[PDB]
Design an enzyme around this catalytic site. Structure first.
Site, mmCIF file in Angstrom:
data_model
loop_
_atom_site.group_PDB
_atom_site.id
_atom_site.type_symbol
_atom_site.label_atom_id
_atom_site.label_comp_id
_atom_site.label_asym_id
_atom_site.label_seq_id
_atom_site.Cartn_x
_atom_site.Cartn_y
_atom_site.Cartn_z
ATOM 1 N N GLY A 55 0.843 -1.132 -0.106
ATOM 2 C CA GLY A 55 0.074 -0.084 -0.122
ATOM 3 C C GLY A 55 0.989 1.349 0.103
ATOM 4 N N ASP A 145 9.224 0.873 7.846
ATOM 5 C CA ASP A 145 9.354 2.321 8.426
ATOM 6 C C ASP A 145 10.192 2.720 9.340
ATOM 7 O OD1 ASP A 145 8.187 0.535 10.041
ATOM 8 O OD2 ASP A 145 7.131 2.090 11.035
ATOM 9 N N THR A 177 4.115 -4.377 27.713
ATOM 10 C CA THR A 177 2.972 -4.505 26.972
ATOM 11 C C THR A 177 2.612 -5.881 26.354
ATOM 12 O OG1 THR A 177 3.801 -3.388 24.962
ATOM 13 C CG2 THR A 177 2.718 -2.146 26.422
ATOM 14 N N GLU A 235 4.240 -8.837 17.367
ATOM 15 C CA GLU A 235 5.001 -8.448 18.465
ATOM 16 C C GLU A 235 4.649 -9.108 19.646
ATOM 17 O OE1 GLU A 235 5.449 -4.234 20.267
ATOM 18 O OE2 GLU A 235 7.282 -4.566 18.920
#
Ligand SMILES: O=c1ccn([C@@H]2O[C@H](COP(=O)(O)OP(=O)(O)O)[C@@H](O)[C@H]2O)c(=O)[nH]1
Ligand SMILES: [Mn+2]
Ligand SMILES: [Mn+2]
Length: 278
Positions: A55, A145, A177, A235
Site C-alpha cells: 500500500g 518504516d 505491554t 509483536e
C-alpha cells in the site's frame, strides 16, 4: 572465535550487556567489528534482509529504507535484499553498491494493516523454505518504516537475534505491554518475562528464523480460531516466542531508536531510527 575476541561488555557499565542465559546485549562501544568482519569474510557469509512494503508504505518508506540499508547494512559482506510488495510497478529501483543485490516478490495485499503485519510471519517462512535457506547464512527481518543511520554490521549476527524495544528497555517486566489474556497463544502472565522485544527487527540463521516465524504464525492462526487477537499482534507473539526460546543475541535500542524519546545518555550511536511518532 571467542567471546573475548569481539565482545567487551565492561566498556558500557551503565546498561545491561549480557543476559542470565549468557546472551550478549550488543551496545555501541562493546563490539569489535574489525575482528568479526575478518572472521566472517574468511567464512564467506552472505546476509539476507526481508522487508515488506504494501500500500502507501511503498512510497512513504521503501526507498529511504533501501537507500540507507545499501549504505549501512553489513558493509563489506554480500547482502541480498528480499523485497515484498503488493505492486511491483511501484518499486523504486535505486542503485545498489558493492556486495548488494536484490530480489523483488509481488505479494497479495491484506486488507487490515494488522493482518499485513502479521502475515509477514507466514510469508517469510515460505520464502525461507523455498530459497533463503540456500542463499544466506544469516537473515534479518525488518519493518520498512525505519532508516539506517549508521553501520549495522556483523556484530549483530547470531543464531537468533532479538531487538530491545526503545521505550521499555529499562522498564520492569510487569509494565511490559505483553498479551495479558490467557485465551491468546501470545499470553505471558504477570511475574514473567525477560525483556520487551521489538518486532521491527529480528533475525538469525535461516533455520532459527524459520522457527520464529512458523511458531508466531501458528499462534496467530490459533488466536484467530479462538476469536481473539493479541494486543500487539505479531509483536506479542514474537515476545512469547523469545520468552520460551531465548535469543542468543540481543541488540541494544541503539539499533532501533525512536528519536521522539529524545536521545538519553545510553544511546551513544544510533544505527537505525523509526520513521513514525506513536
Ligand atoms: O499498511 C501496511 C501495514 C504494515 N506494513 C508492513 O508491516 C510493517 C509493520 O507495520 P507498522 O510498521 O506499521 O507497525 P508499527 O511499527 O507502527 O508499529 C511495516 O513496517 C511494513 O513493512 C505495510 O507494508 N503496509
Ligand atoms: Mn514499524
Ligand atoms: Mn512496538
Amino acid at each position: 572465535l571467542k567471546l573475548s575476541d569481539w565482545f567487551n561488555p565492561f566498556k558500557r557499565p551503565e546498561v545491561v550487556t549480557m543476559t542470565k542465559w549468557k546472551a550478549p546485549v550488543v551496545w555501541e562501544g562493546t563490539y569489535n567489528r574489525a575482528v568479526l568482519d575478518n572472521y566472517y569474510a574468511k567464512q564467506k557469509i552472505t546476509v539476507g534482509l526481508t522487508v515488506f512494503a504494501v500500500g502507501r508504505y511503498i512510497e512513504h518508506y521503501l526507498e529511504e529504507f533501501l537507500t540507507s540499508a545499501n549504505k549501512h547494512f553489513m558493509v563489506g559482506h554480500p547482502v541480498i535484499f528480499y523485497i515484498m510488495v503488493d505492486d511491483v510497478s511501484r518499486m523504486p529501483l535505486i542503485e545498489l553498491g558493492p556486495l548488494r543485490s536484490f530480489k523483488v516478490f509481488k505479494i497479495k495485499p491484506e486488507k487490515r494493516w494488522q493482518d499485513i503485519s502479521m502475515m509477514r510471519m507466514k510469508t517469510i517462512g515460505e520464502h525461507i523454505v523455498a530459497h533463503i535457506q540456500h542463499e544466506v547464512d544469516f537473515l534479518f527481518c525488518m519493518d520498512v518504516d525505519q532508516v539506517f543511520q549508521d553501520k549495522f554490521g556483523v556484530e549483530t549476527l547470531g543464531e537468533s537475534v532479538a531487538q530491545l524495544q526503545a521505550w521499555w528497555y529499562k522498564a520492569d517486566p510487569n509494565d511490559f505491554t505483553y498479551e495479558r489474556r490467557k485465551e491468546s497463544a501470545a499470553y505471558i502472565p504477570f511475574g514473567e518475562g525477560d525483556f520487551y522485544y521489538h518486532a521491527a527487527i529480528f533475525g538469525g540463521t535461516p533455520t532459527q528464523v524459520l522457527n520464529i516465524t512458523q511458531e508466531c504464525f501458528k499462534g496467530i492462526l490459533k488466536d484467530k480460531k479462538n476469536d481473539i487477537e493479541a494486543q500487539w499482534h505479531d509483536e506479542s507473539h514474537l515476545n512469547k516466542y523469545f520468552l520460551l526460546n531465548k535469543p542468543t543475541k540481543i541488540l541494544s535500542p541503539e539499533y532501533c531508536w525512536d528519536y521522539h524519546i529524545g536521545l538519553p545518555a545510553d544511546i551513544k550511536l544510533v544505527k537505525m531510527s523509526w520513521q513514525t511518532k506513536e
